[PDB]
Symmetry: none
Subunit: 61 residues, 6 copies
């Protein structure tokens, strides 16, 4: 009946420092799904299904 | 009946520093899905399904 | 009945510094989907399905 | 008698990413020396004295 | 008599990522020396005295 | 008589990631020397005295 919110964080990323020194980097995909290199991601879903790094091979019927 | 929000963060990214030194980088895809290199992403979905880095192979019926 | 919002962030990215030194970078796609190099993206969807980096192979019926 | 140099780095800075979120920042000096906020500096001195961030109070004789 | 150098690094900084979230930051100096916040600095001195972050109070004679 | 150098690093810093979350930070100096916050520094001195973070109170004669 009364919701008093204040400074309330939800699905939040802050203060990230990364270093990635790589001399070679390959990704070879054939007919599938590949998710690589996600970093510092945030979301908030209301009344729905949410996925950050979701991979699936194939959906058949 | 009364919602008093204040400084309320939702799905927020802030304060990211990245360095990526790579000498070679390849991605070879054949008939699929490849998601690579996502960084510092944010979203907020109301009454819907939300996905940040979603890969799928194929949807058949 | 009364919504008093203030300084409320939603789906927000701020304060990002990136450096990407790469000597070679290739992407070879054949009949699929490839999403690469997303950085500092934000969105907010009301009553709809939202996707940031979504890849799909093919939708058949 | 023969100096063959190649790709020889000396006094070199490369590939720096910084983020500095500060809400207040003061510096109060009275009759002295204050050096603040040096970042990504490089030099090379031949036959001479070199200093990057040197502070001194006073030189009297 | 013959110096063959190759890819020889000297006084080199590379690949640094820093994040500094500070809400307040003060420096109060009175008649002295203050060196603050040096980051990612490089130098090379030949036949001379070199100093990176050197502070001194006062030199009297 | 023959110096064959190759990929020889000297005084080198590489691959540093730091995060510094501080809510308050003060430095109060009176007639002295204060060195604070050095990070990722490199140097190489030939035939001379070198100092990275050197503090001294005062030199009198």
């Amino acid at each position: 009946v009364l919701y008093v919110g204040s400074k309330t964080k939800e699905g939040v990323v802050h203060g990230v420092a990364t270093v990635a020194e790589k001399t070679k980097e390959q990704v070879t995909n054939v007919g599938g799904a590949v998710v690589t290199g996600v970093t510092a991601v945030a979301q908030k879903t209301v009344e729905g299904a949410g996925s950050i790094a979701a991979a699936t091979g194939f959906v058949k019927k």
